[PDB]
Amino acid sequence: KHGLKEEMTMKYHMEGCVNGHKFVITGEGIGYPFKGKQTINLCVIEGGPLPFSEDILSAGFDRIFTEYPQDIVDYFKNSCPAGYTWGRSFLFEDGAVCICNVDITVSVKENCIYHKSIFNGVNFPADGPVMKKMTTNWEASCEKIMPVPKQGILKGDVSMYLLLKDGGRYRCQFDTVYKAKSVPSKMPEWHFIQHKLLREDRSDAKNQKWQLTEHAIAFPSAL
Amino acid sequence: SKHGLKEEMTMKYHMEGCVNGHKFVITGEGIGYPFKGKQTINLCVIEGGPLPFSEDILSAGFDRIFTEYPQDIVDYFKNSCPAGYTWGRSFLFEDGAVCICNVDITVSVKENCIYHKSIFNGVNFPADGPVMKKMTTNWEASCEKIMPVPKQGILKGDVSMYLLLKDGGRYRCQFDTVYKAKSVPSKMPEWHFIQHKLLREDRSDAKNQKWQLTEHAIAFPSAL
Amino acid sequence: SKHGLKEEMTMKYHMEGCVNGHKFVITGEGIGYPFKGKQTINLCVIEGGPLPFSEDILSAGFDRIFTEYPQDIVDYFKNSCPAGYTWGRSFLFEDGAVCICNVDITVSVKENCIYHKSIFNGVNFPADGPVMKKMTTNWEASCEKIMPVPKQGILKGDVSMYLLLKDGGRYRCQFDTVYKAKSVPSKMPEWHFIQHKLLREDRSDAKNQKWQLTEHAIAFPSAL
């Protein structure tokens, strides 16, 4: 349905520039859109090794990978196979700001999902936990998703926390807009999406590489 | 009954406040079910009524004792009883207005009653905005994140709240709370979620400004 | 002397406050020169001393009557006299803490004295931070932007402030003020700048917490 099988293959292309550093990453993955799990492998093909932590990029590389229950309209899967676009701002507690823009499309032939990402940040402190690579993982989150009735789009709101190697937290505010390419027939009532996102660095002598795994579920307001 | 608490209980409220320069004083009584996370309270404005602003900005100002905890998570609030606890919270509204609230909570075991004393102050709400124009209906149901601060012995609350407007729209507000037991706790909870739902019905009339709040709160671990 | 004002004048202060849950009350007297924008005040903590926090967060809490205006800009504050004016201000500190301040100012023509009554509340300052650790020295000189809000008859103040730390560093705070004359003004100023410089010297000892503030303020148009 909507050009999607239970198991799918996926591909990523990030162009970024963080604190003045330009880089370029590409990746491949195997996801399960209906179970809302995915797993992708990324490899830096310019600007390696990155002067900053891998974690700020995690959210840059898809709400299609989110288990919806029957009774909540699945905006993202609905928008397929044409797909959708989002833009997102990141505000970190220590004054840095990243913006990310993404264009997602499905190739029904390939049974593959294409991501094309623009990612830019500034004013990370040189001796801060990002630029000094002090971060372990984003902590599990509960994102609020809300319709915007007359624009035909969705709004993402979530206060994220990056876990630092000493045990502390590094707060970021994500505010996403999600916008399907087609005019959506049916629109969701607001709900929640919980996320659990992991990273293992798999770097080596030649390339910088790591793997992400996400699991995302939508839930209602319930109670 | 181990912490001055009981399945069914009773509550009382005193808020002194000033919003956009306007002073007020409100009190109320309520019946609560701490272990089921259900409370109900009736409030009356006794000085400075009718409020030139919406009642809704005050609702969250008036107790995380009223939260259903599952047994696998340390209930810091109930443990803090009967001495009880205090919190300070900031409200950052999308149209730039800011409120602060301080609250002291304590249990009278003799009365089986829980006492709240609330200081609430707010500045720079636009005259033409949905608060000073009383365009608001109700806070929308929420999911608050609660995190331990191990070495301070205190909890931090972070939630992005939304107030519904009669039009149909949303008016955002950022709540950042610190909750601090009066007595050094031995067990601290690992972080978790608490979901809230809070409704209001105005019950006013000619003589007095009055209204009722119903809150239902449950704590969860991460769902995954 | 047209607005209850004089070249040389005298002032008095009452602040009730609560920061990170700690209640206090402070008063003071001062001598001011409204037309030269120079004031000097001595403050004493009379309830809840010694403060568990830095004195500096209160300084800007304690009057834009004390501002040298050039003759080509409407001085809304002096015009508001002798009835006077009120303001509400929010302090957003970089380490997430938030304060709110409300102030009522009025002149006694009989005393040639200017009366300030200040409500000041602050929440969520980190225990280990430069405020609760009293690491602060002095606000750094500023340039505040003042803008008319024509149809509300009121002024908005916006300034990014910096508090110097003994290390050498800066600790930022965002001030957003509304200033509101008690009486509907006929002339409103076009927007302008006001530059401030505000110094403190603690004058405390065994018996009482005491200190002195000196402020000098001048208003400018855009320099270009």
Next chain:
Amino acid sequence: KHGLKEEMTMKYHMEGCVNGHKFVITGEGIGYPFKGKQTINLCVIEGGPLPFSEDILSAGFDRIFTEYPQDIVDYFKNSCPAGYTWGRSFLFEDGAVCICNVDITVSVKENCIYHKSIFNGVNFPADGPVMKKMTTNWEASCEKIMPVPKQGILKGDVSMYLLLKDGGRYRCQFDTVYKAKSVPSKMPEWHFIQHKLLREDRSDAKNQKWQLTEHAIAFPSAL
């Protein structure tokens, strides 16, 4: 001094993507670095006509154009001819966020200053004053500039206001980092910089074009 004459010629290259819209602008100008005035002409060479207001870009296209008094260290002119780089975040009252990154260099041969700008924004409201082109001019500002002692860099802080066609204001918060390419010998004490920046659109049937003029002076804390 520092590879700069009293009158200079200047050139601009912006790549941007705003609310998902990609574009590309180039420009030329005549500036007076020591009198702190400049004037540049810009022309959109991709993505014209822009779906958003010209004004959000003004600050994207140089603190070399700033009259310093003798007694304040001129960081920017000092950093020349090698030049400098900056990154800046824009936070607008209605929740939109833009980031901009710039690389400035002087060509002593040409007596010309080169700008190369990356500019990206998200989450402008579709019916807001930006996307609906409701803006007239940035209102005159007073920017605070502060040394960062041990990093060898400067920090920019200024609350900006865009004037709307109805007469109101649209607040943005600029927070810039300025970073010379060379290790600076001497460092400034903090000061102010006042700016007055103007726009006149000079569009026509074929291209979108407009002119900016700035005047910037540094002043001390004085009083």
